[PDB]
Amino acid sequence: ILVDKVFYEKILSVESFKENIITQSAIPKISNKEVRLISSGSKIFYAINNTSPHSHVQLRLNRFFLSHIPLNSAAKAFVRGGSYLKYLEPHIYGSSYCRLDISSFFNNISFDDVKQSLSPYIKDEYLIGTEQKLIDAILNSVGYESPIRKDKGMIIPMGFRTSPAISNIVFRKMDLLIQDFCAKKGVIYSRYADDMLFSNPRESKLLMSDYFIDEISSLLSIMGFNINQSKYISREKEISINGYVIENKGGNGSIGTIRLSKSKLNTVLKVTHALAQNIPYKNICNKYIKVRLKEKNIKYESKKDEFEKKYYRDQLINYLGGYRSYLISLVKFHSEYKCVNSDFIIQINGILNDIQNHIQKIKKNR
Amino acid sequence: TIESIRVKNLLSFDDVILRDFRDINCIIGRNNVGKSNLLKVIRYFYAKLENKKVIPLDFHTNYNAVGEITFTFDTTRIKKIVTSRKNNGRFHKHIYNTLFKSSSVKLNFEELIARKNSTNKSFFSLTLTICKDDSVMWSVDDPKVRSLL
Amino acid sequence: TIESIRVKNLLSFDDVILRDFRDINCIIGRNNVGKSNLLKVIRYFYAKLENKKVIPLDFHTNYNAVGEITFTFDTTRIKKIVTSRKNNGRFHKHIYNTLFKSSSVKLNFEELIARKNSTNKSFFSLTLTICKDDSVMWSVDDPKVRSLL
DNA sequence: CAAGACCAATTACACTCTGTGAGTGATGAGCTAGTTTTT
RNA sequence: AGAAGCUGAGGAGUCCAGUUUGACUGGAUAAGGUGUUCGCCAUCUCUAGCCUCAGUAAAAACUAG
């Protein structure tokens, strides 16, 4: 995919930045007024107002331009057809497991690397007279001059709709390098966002050695990425990643299994048990799911009790439907790949039956 | 005795898995190139099993550094034959020592071994990986296993 | 044109080196296998130059992990052609940039470049390495030099 | 800290010299919206 | 040698430890049992193991039998 001025005007900036092209006006950058900061723990996120032309132009950039750039198969995140289940699937053939994490990923992505990665797919031509190139015009819709970190240039924010695709595009090179290294070492490699999973089918201590860590760090140092040593995992014959258990007790061509631990399903089991105890929906909504009517934002003056009851019923409906969708997504993944424990299949079938019965009961009570 | 054939990033395959094989499996379709590529993949895999010098297959996309082929063999009947205390032949012991032993044998409790083979079926997975430098890597680093298969 | 051809640990050649090539070279001998192997080595080297997927050559002995093919080209006439001020075409500049530019930036223009402008000859050495895993390595890490040669 | 390994895709001469490579029923109605991972 | 944690602010009762006769500080209810690569891990069984306020942006898979 290659873009020109005509493609940018007629597809990407169809109406948002239409006054700039006609009246010889350079594309403005993203100001602090149109971006708001949301704090969660030690993390910050940048949200762009929908009324801003940059939001529309970056939405169309993601829809028409970033989706056509080729990626690496090891990237199982932020891609059409990608999923966490596909991120964990290739490692059923391995006997040893090693999970690594990069540092703050979107913060360590240099803007120069983004420009270099997106240069081959964008024509090297000037857009607004002999003032600004098309590269800068497109890149001004994806970055943000953050007011923190001593103002060290444009940084890819963690809350834009164009960040993940650009991250995968700029990390395609590192994915290729790491995949080549692991293929030389006979290691299956997969990546989800910034979490890297490595699986060794052979009976070797390569994944438990410091050499693997040093090689991955040296490869990541090319683009400035580091490794979070606080979340280093290196196990054998079994691994647990966020409640997903991959188990393979054997060697010389042994098929592993993927299941979910009881910790992952504990919340839904508690919800079902509470429903079986006829507990009022207020407690379940405010405790198990963490959903409330914040500061009584009812706006309209009307029968508030009925609306509150309807909200505390339909939100529970939505939670049950979402979790049953998650479980049946898992069973569809099993049907597609056949890498899930039969006992876990029976357990999730029972849980699905219980959830269906409970949602039927609560709909009847409605 | 074969249940799964998986091809990833080779010829015209991105990620294609063929399963639930029958006795009289038939192949139809307008995509003759796909059938030819599948035949080429199978022939290349069985040539590399026999340790023959052949030109490596082409990648579907060059933005990936790995081309993979997975073959899963159903080894239930041969396991039942070799694990019987009635045929102590040389070839039977060779098969038992080559494909079987270790893994689920002598690496777990006796109760697991006793209940290991009641009604279940055993599968053997073999992976061929083609790198960018025309190098072939195997999931198991034992030429005897490949020759026996 | 060409000065030396060196074959190490490939086919029937152990440390064989051929030099002092004239306009007409007559190859005689009772060992036809040697002539055939030399022809195979030359053809394999020139096929790898043009990036053709071909089966790698067999090693003389398996107790060696490397097989080398070394070609030395007498790049003296072409260097004089591309160095001359009169010739400033696209192809001449390309030849100068891809062969006679890396070796020129390392030499001082005031003394070394002036001294090298004499009757002395310049040579270009290119080595092809075959590894145990059917992998090909080159002394120069860029296809442009190989393609132009 | 500091680091080898830094993706892939992007036919041919030339001149004066013809041989040489160069010196030359229009603003009361009033409302909402999953799971998981990255984070 | 800088990376990490960490959605934040809190509150009531009770326990432990310390100082201290009188109040403060630190921790802190996903409960119990078993095995563990000892990990925030896995597995099994119940009666399911506190409450209030503030904040919640993005991209992917999933609405099956």
Curated annotation (Swiss-Prot), chain A:
Positions contributing to Mg(2+) binding: 101, 194-195
A Pfam family the protein falls into: RVT_1
Enzyme class: transferase
Annotated gene: ret
The name this protein goes by in its record: Retron Eco8 reverse transcriptase
Reverse transcriptase domain span: 19-246
Entry keywords, A to Z: Antiviral defense, Magnesium, Metal-binding, Nucleotidyltransferase, RNA-binding, RNA-directed DNA polymerase, Transferase
Function: Reverse transcriptase (RT) component of antiviral defense system retron Eco8, composed of this RT, the following endonuclease and a non-coding RNA (ncRNA) encoded between them. Expression of retron Eco8 confers protection against bacteriophages T4, T6, T7 and SECphi4, SECphi6 and SECphi18. At multiplicity of infection (MOI) of 0.02 cultures slow growth when infected with SECphi4 but do not collapse, at MOI 2 cultures collapse. Responsible for synthesis of msDNA (a branched molecule with RNA linked by a 2',5'-phosphodiester bond to ssDNA).
Superkingdom field: Bacteria
Species this protein is from: Escherichia coli
Any GO BP: defense response to virus
The enzyme's E.C. designation: 2.7.7.49
Catalytic reaction annotation: DNA(n) + a 2'-deoxyribonucleoside 5'-triphosphate = DNA(n+1) + diphosphate
InterPro entries per record: DNA/RNA_pol_sf (IPR043502), GrpII_Intron_Splice-Mob/Def (IPR051083), Reverse_transcriptase_msDNA (IPR000123), RT_dom (IPR000477)
Entry similarity comment: Belongs to the bacterial reverse transcriptase family.
Gene Ontology molecular function terms on file: metal ion binding; RNA binding; RNA-directed DNA polymerase activity
Curated annotation (Swiss-Prot), chains B, C:
Domain of life: Bacteria
Region called ATPase domain N-terminus, residue ranges: 1-149
Disulfide bond sites: none
Residues involved in ATP binding: 32-36
Family named by the database record: Belongs to the class 1 OLD nuclease family.
UniProt subunit comment: Homodimer.
Function recorded in the entry: Probable nuclease member of antiviral defense system retron Eco8, composed of an reverse transcriptase (RT), this nuclease and a non-coding RNA (ncRNA) encoded between them. Expression of retron Eco8 confers protection against bacteriophages T4, T6, T7 and SECphi4, SECphi6 and SECphi18. At multiplicity of infection (MOI) of 0.02 cultures slow growth when infected with SECphi4 but do not collapse, at MOI 2 cultures collapse. When the retron is cloned in another E.coli strain synthesizes msDNA (a branched RNA linked by a 2',5'-phosphodiester bond to a single-stranded DNA).
Name of this chain's protein: Retron Eco8 OLD nuclease
UniProt gene name: old
Residues of the full protein shown: 2 to 150 of 750
